[PDB]
Amino acid sequence: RQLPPANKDAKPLLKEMKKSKEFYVIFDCSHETAAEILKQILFMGMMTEYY
Amino acid sequence: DYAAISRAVLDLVLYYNWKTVTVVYEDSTGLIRLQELIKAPSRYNIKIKIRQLPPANKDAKPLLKEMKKSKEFYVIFDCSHETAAEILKQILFMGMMTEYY
Amino acid sequence: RQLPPANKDAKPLLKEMKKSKEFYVIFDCSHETAAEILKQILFMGMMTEYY
Amino acid sequence: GIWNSNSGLNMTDTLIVTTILEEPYVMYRKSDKPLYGNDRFEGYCLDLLKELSNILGFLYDVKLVPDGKYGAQNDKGEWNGMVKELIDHRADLAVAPLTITYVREKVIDFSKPFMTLGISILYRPGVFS
Amino acid sequence: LAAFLTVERMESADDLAKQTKIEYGAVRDGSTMTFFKKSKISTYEKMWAFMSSRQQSALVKNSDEGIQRVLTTDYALLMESTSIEYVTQRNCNLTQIGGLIDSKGYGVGTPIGSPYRDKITIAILQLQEEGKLHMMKEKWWR
Amino acid sequence: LAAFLTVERMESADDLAKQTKIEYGAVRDGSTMTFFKKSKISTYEKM
Amino acid sequence: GGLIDSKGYGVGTPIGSPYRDKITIAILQLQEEGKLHMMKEKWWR
C-alpha cells in the first residue's frame, strides 16, 4: 500500500486495511508521520490486541 | 512520466484481464515504473509475484527456470532495450516462447 | 507427413503439426536437413518440454 | 490501440410474439365465420397481450413456436422451443405460460411474473352390496 | 365384514416415487421435466430416473396428451398447479395430489437486453394494481 | 378370526422390489439383464 | 403387472450389411400379407 502524500489523515487507508482483515503490517515512514499514523490507529480502534 | 507510464501498464493489464502476473525489474527505476501495478492488487482482483533479474551474471537462466517451474505465463519485464534483447535470447533458449506465455 | 523438398518452407508443415497437437515426432533426413528443421522448430516455438 | 494520458485506452484498433397452444392460456378461437391472423387465437395470454399492447402501444403478430416446445437445453448445450426463438431473435416477445427459471435467465430475460404456480400432481349402495 | 371394512378404511410424490405400478411423467422439454432432470433431492432424483428410463413413455409431447394419458391410463401427470386447477375444475374425477413441489411464476420472455422487458414488467404491475390479472384469471378459469 | 382375516387382506415390479422373500432375476447376458443393469430408475436400480 | 418397456425383435446383421434393408422390406411384405400374424398364431397357438 501507500500513505496519502501530504494529507496524512490516512483514515481511509486504515479503514481499507481493517476491511481486508490485514493484521501484520510493515509501516515504513519517517517518525514524525509515524506518530500521526499511530494517533490515527488509536483513533480508529486498531490499536488492539489483534494487530 | 514514470507514474503516467505505470498507469498505462496497469490500464493495459486490466484490459487484458490477467489474474496472475509476474513482474520483473532490473533496477530502482523498474520498481518506480511498476509502482502503480504493484499497489494495484489492493484495489483490483489481480495477484502479483515480483522478481528481479540478476545484476552481474547476465544469464538469467536460473530465474527463467524457476519462473517456468512455478508456472508463470503472464510476465512483465522492466528492462532497457539491450537487456531486453539479451533476455529475449535467454527466454528463447529456455523454450518459453510458446503460445502459453 | 513429408517435408517440402528444397524450398525448405518447412514452417507450414511444422505449423500443421503444432495445430494438430502432435507432440511425439520421428524425423528421418540427413544431418544438414535435420539442422535446418531444428532451427525452424525453435523459430515456430515447438522446442518445449511437451515435444 | 493507443493510451492517452488524461483519456485512457482506445484499444479497439410490428412485434413478433412467439407462443404455444395450452389451455386456457392460448387456444384456437371457435367461430362459424372465417378467422385470420391473431384473431385465430383466444385465451388468457391473448387478453394479456392485448392489454400489454394498449399500455405500451405496439402492434404484434402471433406465431406459434414451430417445434411446439416450451424450451429445454439439450445434452450438448443447445436450446429449443420458445426460448430458442427468443435467443435467435426470431421473436420479440414470448407471451405464454412460460416458467421463469434460473437456467433460462442465463439466456433470455423475463418480465416479473404475471401469475404464480408450482409443480404438483394431476391424478384421479342397495341390496347388491 | 370387519376385515372388509378395516382394509377399505385404513387406506404425494413420495407415494408415486416408492412404487412402480402407476406410471408418472411430465411434458417433454418443459420446465417441469428439467426440474426433475436437474433435481439433487433423492426422491425427485429417483423419479427422474423412473420417467427418464421409461422416457419415450413417461414423458408426454404436451399437456393435452398428458391429461389424456391420466384419463385413459393408470398415469399421474406432473403438471403445474394453475393448469391442474383448470383441469380438475372441469372433471370431478381428477384431482391434485399433494401440495406444490416448488414455487415460481410465469413471465413474458424477451431476448436478452430487450428494452421491452422492464416496460412489460411495469405494465404487468399496472394490470395487477387495477385488478385485471384477477379478472382475467377468473374469466378463463371461471 | 377378524384378527386373522384382516391380516389375510394385506398381501408389479415394485411389489417385488420392496421385498426380499421372493427371489427374482433374468437371463444372463440378455437385453433384460442389461436393461436393469443400466436403468437409472430407482426401483429397477434397486432390483 | 404390465410391460416395463416397449420394443421389438429384429434380424441382426453385421454393420453396413446390404441385406438389412432388404430384410426389412421382406418383413414388411410378410406383415402386409398377414403372414407374421399367421406365424405367431401357428406357434403360440
Swiss-Prot record, chain D:
Assembly behavior: Homotetramer or heterotetramer of pore-forming glutamate receptor subunits. Tetramers may be formed by the dimerization of dimers. Can form functional heteromeric receptors with GRIK4 and GRIK5. Interacts with KLHL17.
Function of the protein: Ionotropic glutamate receptor that functions as a cation-permeable ligand-gated ion channel, gated by L-glutamate and the glutamatergic agonist kainic acid. L-glutamate acts as an excitatory neurotransmitter at many synapses in the central nervous system. Binding of the excitatory neurotransmitter L-glutamate induces a conformation change, leading to the opening of the cation channel, and thereby converts the chemical signal to an electrical impulse. The receptor then desensitizes rapidly and enters a transient inactive state, characterized by the presence of bound agonist.
Protein's name according to its UniProt entry: Glutamate receptor ionotropic, kainate 1
Residues carrying sugar: 10
Note: The postsynaptic actions of Glu are mediated by a variety of receptors that are named according to their selective agonists. This receptor binds domoate > kainate > L-glutamate = quisqualate > CNQX = DNQX > AMPA > dihydrokainate > NMDA.
Entry's localization field: Cell membrane; Postsynaptic cell membrane
Family per similarity comment: Belongs to the glutamate-gated ion channel (TC 1.A.10.1) family. GRIK1 subfamily.
Tissue specificity note: Expressed in the olfactory bulb (at protein level). Expressed in subsets of neurons throughout the developing and adult central and peripheral nervous systems. In the CNS principally in the medial amygdaloid nuclei, medial habenulae, pyriform and cingulate cortices, and Purkinje cell layer. Also highly expressed in embryonic and adult dorsal root ganglia. Expressed at high levels in the trigeminal ganglion neurons.
UniProt binding sites for L-glutamate: 97, 99, 104
Protein's gene: Grik1
